[PDB]
Amino acid sequence: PKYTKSVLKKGDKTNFPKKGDVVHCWYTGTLQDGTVFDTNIQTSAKKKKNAKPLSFKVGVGKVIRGWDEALLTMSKGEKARLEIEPEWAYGKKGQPDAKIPPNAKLTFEVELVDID
Ligand SMILES: CO[C@H]1C[C@@H]2CC[C@@H](C)[C@@](O)(O2)C(=O)C(=O)N2CCCC[C@H]2C(=O)O[C@H]([C@H](C)C[C@@H]2CC[C@@H](O)[C@H](OC)C2)CC(=O)[C@H](C)/C=C(\C)[C@@H](O)[C@@H](OC)C(=O)[C@H](C)C[C@H](C)/C=C/C=C/C=C/1C
């Protein structure tokens, strides 16, 4: 796989998402030099899902390839760090209009909040 995952806080080890499911996630993304280019983790309130965690369906290509594959190995509660090679993120061109330089390897802390 072209990502690397380190478990930072262990999940419940029972509830894992399948390719069907909708996952609810908090995240922070940093570029190589350390600058966080995006987070949804909030210092005003979490409360109550204000603001709301990210939601998408796993395994169906709604998100970048690194996220899609890594979410399938996480259990509910798990906070993990993910280093994703450019090939499994925004690749050669990157996404300039969204702060992603060309050929950036990207590091994300991700936390699985809930699965339905
Ligand atoms: C302001 O914050 C943005 C998130 C930003 C966008 C730009 C990137 C730098 C970034 O900074 O986040 C970022 O941190 C990032 O790289 N992320 C977001 C967190 C998950 C991983 C990654 C990502 O894959 O983003 C995604 C990346 C940008 C796009 C994918 C790239 C690969 C390709 O396979 C996919 O095609 C399907 C599109 C953005 C998302 O996580 C959102 C949730 C999903 C989509 C937009 C698409 O799946 C779309 O499909 C048409 C949908 O079905 C959605 C649900 C439809 C509804 C109406 C739109 C919601 C839009 C929400 C946008 C949000 C909260």
Pocket test for ligand 1, best of 31, 39, 64, 88 (most atoms within 8 A of CB): 64
Query: Across the chain, where does the E strand assignment appear?
Result: 3-9, 22-30, 36-39, 54-57, 79-84, 106-115
Q: List the CATH number of the domain containing 30.
A: 3.10.50.40
Compute the distance between CA of residue 112 and CA of residue 56 in angstroms, rounded to an integer: 12
Helices (H), 8-98: 65-71
- Contact present, 55 and 23 (Cβ < 8 Å): yes
- Contact present, 84 and 116 (Cβ < 8 Å): no
User: Gaps after which residues in the chain, C–N over 2.5 Å?
Assistant: none
Compute the distance between CA of residue 116 and CA of residue 91 in angstroms, rounded to an integer: 30
The resolution of the experimental structure, rounded to one decimal in Å, is 2.5
Helices (H), 31-90: 65-71
| Six-digit token string for 102 | 């060309």
Q: How many distinct structural domains can be found in the chain?
A: 1
Query: Hey, whose CA ends up nearest to atom 7 of ligand 1?
Result: 98
Cα of 4 from ligand 1 centre, angstroms: 21
Ramachandran region, residue 11 (left: φ > 0; alpha: ψ -120 to 50; beta: rest) = beta
- Contact present, 102 and 47 (Cβ < 8 Å): no
Compute the distance between CA of residue 46 and CA of residue 49 in angstroms, rounded to an integer: 5
Compute the distance between CA of residue 10 and CA of residue 100 in angstroms, rounded to an integer: 29
Which residues participate in catalysis according to the annotation? 27, 37-38, 64, 90, 108
Compute the distance between CA of residue 73 and CA of residue 71 in angstroms, rounded to an integer: 5
Cα of 17 from ligand 1 centre, angstroms: 19
Compute the distance between CA of residue 53 and CA of residue 23 in angstroms, rounded to an integer: 9
∠ Cα 51 30 22 (to 5°): 45
Domain that holds residue 60: 1-116
With a 6 Å cutoff on the Cβ, whether 62 touches ligand 1 is yes
| Six-digit token string for 42 | 């909030």
The b/e string for 82-112 (b: 16+ C-beta within 10 A; e otherwise) is: bbbbbebbbbeebeeeeebeeebbbbbbbbb
Compute the distance between CA of residue 104 and CA of residue 93 in angstroms, rounded to an integer: 9
Q: Which candidate, 77, 24, 18, places its Cα nearest to that of 54?
A: 24
With a 6 Å cutoff on the Cβ, whether 23 touches ligand 1 is no
